[PDB]
Design a protein around this ligand. Structure first.
Ligand SMILES: O[C@@H]1[C@H](O)[C@@H](O)OC[C@@H]1O
Ligand SMILES: O[C@@H]1[C@H](O)[C@@H](O)OC[C@@H]1O
Ligand SMILES: [Mg+2]
Ligand SMILES: [Mg+2]
Ligand SMILES: [Mg+2]
Ligand code: NA
Ligand code: NA
Ligand code: NA
Ligand code: NA
Ligand code: NA
Lengths: 1015, 211, 174
């Protein structure tokens, strides 16, 4: 029957013989075990070593495999994705389906994974009760056999499939045979932008339930007006024979204290003309002054559901963690426990660079600790239901969750082709309904989502309404079809900008400020996706947070996204490197578009993370005189693990510092008057820096964790003292080819044909490997390249405009080169024009003034043609011969910062190893810039002025020519880029120009000055 | 849904039609056991969606109905909304689960009386005059079924019409029903006689209740 | 496969290979005939005399019936309810289900009506275009074969079930 029916090519068949979905079960036969959440003897894991064999199609699987192990098969760990074991290639595609679009058909060549397990079943399990097998995740469709007999079938890669094996199992030795298909009709609803894999990638288990059993249970909590009283309402459903002696007891535990209890026989209230549910009962428990759940304080209670005889025999117990909270939308605002939320969120895919899409506790816990340490309070399950442990962990650590159905049909044309088709409604409804049935008891889930990028179809409306009837406790959102359709309680656009309209036909992305006030619109707006963190990104992030804080109805959003989807490959010498689309022979592919994370695959932060942490701070600061006003953005907690550390410094030199305990009510204020400050001796700018420090460790942070910070300029005393006059005076030496300047051991050489400083000496040691030259270009960022699909050569992209204007191939044509001798200095004057095909793009006019002290003052004025695309930078570069261990600077840091991503950086004296001055973006680009720099020290060199710089062993040229970071090689000496001016990086999205006007170099005329000397 | 020709005839002769999905689960306990169950949503949706897809061009069809006597389940609410998105041109009604649920645009009770309340638990049948003005209620009331014409019947029919005429929001209803469901049998002499439940050896049966 | 699957005991399978639903079609190839609602030569009625045989259960239907008329079969009018021909009794019940309430299961003794028709198709229908069959009402579920080959399955007694026969038809007698 199985090969004939071809169930994996029929959206009308999404399962066979599959059991009903339900909340997590353990079937404890001891109530105390249930309470403490200790392991259950009735829930066994079948994870570990399985047997596996790959096939090109299901028609190639031999019948013998149903009964006997195949000799050609290997022993593999389960859960796993079979691509991660090397059996076939993972595919990275974004929108375009990895298969020909021909619903409901898949390719005849359909990679088939044959999994099998020989395992033991105890006699005790088969004498009584029910033995079921649970597969938490199988991608993307599968048939199941037990001891050679067919059991069933299932689709949906991201929710558990359960089968009753009671009549299939024998005492002692049993064998499972699972035929997993890579492609099925289910794949048409699984077109998420991520690695396309397959296999048994989540936990497998055996559960024993009694014949008379808890088959379902729902927990609700409702409150009076000020949350001083709650009612816990637990609806419990049974299966098996109805008996008058049967009871359910639901008891509520706060630690080891029972706070509430209720017991009742089965038989619900009358529902309609035919009576009520004889197989259900609802328990109502009164709770006075409940401890409320939130991400700020994740207060949890324990609910234990006992099924038992009246006279006291426990049949079984189920249990869950209960968080008392109310989620409602009122008057256009999303409220949690009566208070308006501000969502500091992030999208998070389930991705591991070694294990692919298999999730583990350690990784999960790691992710949560980093999110909370970086001031996130919410996560979106983009774009499928997660591993069941994720929710438990979010309940316990405190994160607001958006639980999202596994429905994405992005590659369809138009996007709603299937979601508007009533024939796809059954397949879609199982992906929504079974999610809700599984996760409805987790306090951390506050919002349901109908899926991702599937346009808007009538099926969405039907399923929106289904959730609303079944679970009134949670708002429902969905972005497709324009982010504000009738299938969403929340305006939830992706990549809508703060002030800029993007008026696409049918599905415009209005400026979020404008969107709120469109005629008739009243809903809250929370971006489901914003600030695309692809490579060197997150420019303009502060602009979002400013608008979120000013507008009540702008209640935040979810950054796209948490972690790069790079996978580990190994080179000829067994050395690991990070791979993206195309690196596995996968084609068509979308290259590096799988890497949009705030963190690297191994969870090392990108520089953007610190920008996110800073803007998402829960404490706001204003300064008036010597009074710091701290304002709390917490809604529920007092600042009871917080102290303020303040520091005043003069150009990096500490003058005063102290600490004050923070004592701020949620939403409240505190004034801190700083003590009288000592008057600075020397000249320069005083800077105030404040840091909020957590003295005590928490479940999510170490003692001393810095949670917030801010800087201000205080008094400035401008230097009026002239430099001490020098006795020495530098000598010029002229030839037709050179101007040579000499002063003691120091020597400068200007080439008279090129017009640049070609060499410089200290002692008799050369300092340059490449002349000092103007630079108007950068190795293009992912945002500059602005493609989301490998096939779209966009002429509007910044990189393409720079290329077509000739910025990268413009040649310096000398206009002027003269020398002059002054009373105490030699003065070199130069002018260059940069030209491409008869057009002058840039003109650079310079003076180099070398005096008796040993200092060279470089004055640069630049003209930029108004009709050429604004240049990426305006500065100078050279390759220094010296390689030093350290880089020391007075400017913004310590991390990489760009003009539209520098709010998190602090002005101070920073000192890092050279390697920390390069950011290892997997796809290489301009990187490691630091802005607001007044002084830079590298070996014997010092530069002074007001500039931006990067410094590393890689030229802008190498960076733009090398596709992968691991293929880079340290060049001889050190490449220095010193910019008077640098363009923003953008990032509102990564596939259209996104650098805001105020960060574009459009002023036409530019001036900067630098002083180079030896220390 | 009826024979296709019925709609053509109603279009041409002139009759307002309520087109009703082939969904009735009266015998379930409670009546919404299947209709509240997500596993039955697919079978249910096909009965609604394929009706609309077939009959939506007929001018005679003025109202869509989600079926008959299947309590009120969440599937009803989903299918209600599906019609409203796909075809805003017609109101959707459905009597199950109390005749005034969230799955109906029209208060459509069966056998609610004119002046006398029948306060059954959960699914009461208010006096139709009283029903209209319950706190917050704004919808029109058209009885999906009234005046059960079983045998010697239709006493008090005039009471309904007086009420329909006096109250703007009392907009009529549908009598139950048009034709006796009696079948022809033949005695020993080959002579025809009208038969009802039980006369075919059918058991259990409900006797004359088919007429 | 058809007996082993028991699609009539699975509310997840309400049809197999059934075409999408739509408003009434006649495929006129002349505009004036369409305007005036006159008959279409592309819409043929299969109403009239069919062959019918009653069985106590689907398991009792002999495989020979797929390819050959059964000698024991009678000639009856279609459309018809087979209770109205005397084959088994019609049942009058109001609320209480005529079968034991045990979803999705039905009685193992499940009266089965085996209908068959030998019919001719025009030559030009076989070389070009799409020929579908339309069943306006079948109570309550059915499997369909054409020339011994399985076509599909359908439920819901009160709406049309349509199947593409284009690949199943042969020259002359079907
Ligand atoms: O593809 C990812 C996401 O699923 C989509 O909604 O936005 C772009 C991002 O990179
Ligand atoms: O809408 C965006 C774009 O259309 C696509 O190509 O990349 C993902 C993102 O959602
Ligand atoms: Mg299928
Ligand atoms: Mg997508
Ligand atoms: Mg069926
Ligand atoms: Na806000
Ligand atoms: Na992506
Ligand atoms: Na590059
Ligand atoms: Na009236
Ligand atoms: Na009746």
């Amino acid at each position: 029957v199985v090969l004939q029916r071809r169930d994996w090519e029929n959206p009308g068949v999404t399962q066979l013989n599959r059991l009903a979905a339900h909340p997590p079960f353990a079937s404890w036969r001891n109530s105390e075990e249930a309470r403490t959440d200790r392991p259950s003897q009735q829930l066994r894991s079948l994870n570990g070593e399985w047997r596996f064999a790959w096939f090109p199609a299901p028609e190639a699987v031999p019948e013998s495999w149903l009964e006997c192990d195949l000799p050609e098969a290997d022993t593999v760990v389960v859960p796993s994705n079979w691509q991660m074991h090397g059996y076939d290639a993972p595919i990275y595609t974004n929108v375009t389906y990895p298969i020909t679009v021909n619903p409901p058909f898949v390719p005849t060549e359909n990679p088939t994974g044959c999994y099998s397990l020989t395992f033991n079943v105890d006699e005790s399990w088969l004498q009584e009760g029910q033995t079921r097998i649970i597969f938490d995740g199988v991608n993307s469709a599968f048939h199941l056999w037990c001891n050679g007999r067919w059991v069933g079938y299932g689709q949906d890669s991201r929710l558990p499939s359960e089968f009753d094996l009671s009549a299939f199992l024998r005492a002692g030795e049993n064998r499972l045979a699972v035929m997993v298909l890579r492609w099925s009709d289910g794949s048409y609803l699984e077109d998420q932008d991520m690695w396309r894999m397959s296999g048994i990638f989540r936990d497998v288990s055996l559960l024993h339930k009694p014949t008379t059993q808890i088959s379902d249970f729902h927990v609700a909590t409702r409150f009076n007006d000020d949350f001083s009283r709650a009612v816990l309402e637990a609806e419990v459903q049974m299966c098996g024979e109805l008996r008058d002696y049967l009871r359910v007891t639901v008891s509520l535990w706060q630690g080891e204290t029972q706070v509430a209890s209720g017991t009742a026989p089965f038989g619900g209230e009358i529902i309609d003309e035919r009576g009520g549910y004889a197989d259900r009962v609802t328990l109502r428990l009164n709770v006075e002054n409940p401890k409320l759940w939130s991400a700020e304080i994740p207060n949890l209670y324990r609910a234990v559901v006992e099924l038992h005889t009246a006279d006291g025999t426990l049949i079984e117990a189920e249990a869950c963690d209960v968080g008392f909270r109310e989620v409602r939308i009122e008057n256009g605002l999303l409220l949690l426990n009566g208070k308006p939320l501000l969502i500091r969120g992030v999208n998070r895919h389930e991705h591991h660079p070694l294990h692919g899409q298999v999730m583990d506790e350690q990784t999960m816990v790691q992710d949560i600790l980093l999110m909370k340490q970086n001031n996130f309070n919410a996560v979106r399950c983009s774009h499928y239901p997660n591993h069941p442990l994720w929710y438990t962990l979010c309940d316990r650590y405190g994160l607001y969750v958006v639980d999202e159905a596994n429905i994405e049909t992005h590659g369809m044309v138009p996007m709603n082709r299937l979601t508007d088709d009533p024939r796809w409604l059954p397949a879609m409804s199982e992906r929504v309904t079974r999610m809700v049935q599984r996760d409805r008891n987790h306090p951390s889930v506050i919002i349901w989502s109908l899926g991702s990028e599937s346009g808007h179809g009538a099926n969405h409306d039907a399923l929106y309404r289904w959730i609303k009837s079944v679970d009134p406790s949670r708002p429902v959102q969905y972005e497709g079809g324009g982010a504000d359709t009738t299938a969403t309680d929340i305006i939830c656009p992706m990549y809508a900008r703060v002030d800029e309209d993007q008026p696409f036909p049918a599905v415009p992305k209005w400026s979020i400020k404008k969107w709120l006030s469109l005629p008739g619109e009243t809903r809250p707006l929370i971006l489901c996706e914003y600030a695309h963190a692809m490579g060197n990104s997150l420019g303009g992030f502060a602009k979002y947070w400013q608008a979120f804080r000013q507008y009540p109805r702008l209640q935040g959003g979810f950054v796209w996204d948490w972690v790069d989807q790079s996978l580990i490959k190994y080179d000829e010498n067994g050395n690991p490197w990070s791979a993206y689309g195309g690196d596995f022979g996968d084609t068509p592919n979308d290259r590096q578009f799988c890497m949009n994370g705030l963190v690297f695959a191994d969870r090392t932060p990108h520089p953007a993370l610190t920008e996110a942490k800073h803007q998402q701070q829960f404490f706001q600061f204003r300064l008036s005189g010597q009074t710091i006003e701290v304002t709390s953005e917490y809604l529920f907690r007092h600042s009871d693990n917080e102290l303020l550390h303040w520091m005043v410094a003069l150009d990096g030199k500490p003058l005063a510092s102290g600490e004050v305990p923070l004592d701020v009510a949620p939403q409240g204020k505190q004034l801190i008057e700083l003590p009288e400050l000592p008057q600075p001796e020397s000249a320069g700018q005083l800077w105030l820096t404040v840091r909020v420090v957590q003295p005590n460790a928490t479940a999510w942070s170490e003692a001393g964790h810095i949670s917030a910070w801010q800087q201000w300029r205080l008094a400035e005393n401008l230097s009026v003292t002239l430099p001490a006059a020098s006795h020495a005076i530098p000598h010029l030496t002229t030839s037709e080819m050179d101007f040579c300047i000499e002063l003691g051991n120091k020597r400068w050489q200007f080439n008279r044909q090129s017009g640049f400083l070609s060499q410089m000496w200290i002692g008799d040691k050369k300092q340059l490997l490449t002349p000092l030259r103007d630079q108007f270009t950068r190795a293009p960022l992912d945002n500059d390249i602005g493609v989301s699909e490998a096939t779209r050569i966009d002429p509007n992209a910044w990189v393409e405009r720079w290329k077509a204007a000739g910025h990268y191939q413009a040649e310096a044509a000398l206009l002027q080169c003269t020398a002059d001798t002054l009373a105490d200095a030699v003065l070199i004057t130069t002018a260059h024009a940069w030209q491409h095909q008869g057009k002058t793009l840039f003109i650079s006019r310079k003076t180099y003034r070398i005096d008796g002290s040993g200092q060279m003052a470089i004055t640069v004025d630049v003209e930029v043609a108004s009709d050429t695309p604004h240049p990426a930078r305006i500065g100078l570069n050279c390759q220094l011969a010296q390689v030093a261990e350290r880089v020391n600077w007075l400017g913004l840091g310590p991390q990489e910062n760009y003009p539209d991503r520098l709010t998190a950086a602090c002005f101070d004296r920073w000192d890092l190893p050279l390697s920390d001055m390069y950011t290892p973006y997997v796809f290489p680009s301009e990187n490691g810039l630091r802005c607001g720099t007044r002084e830079l020290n590298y070996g014997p060199h010092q530069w002074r002025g007001d500039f931006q710089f990067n410094i590393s062993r890689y030229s802008q040229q190498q960076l733009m020519e090398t596709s992968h970071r691991h293929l880079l090689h340290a060049e001889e000496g050190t490449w220095l880029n010193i910019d008077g001016f640098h363009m923003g990086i953008g990032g509102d999205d990564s596939w259209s120009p996104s650098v805001s006007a105020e960060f574009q170099l459009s002023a036409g005329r530019y001036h900067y000055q630098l002083v180079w000397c030896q220390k």
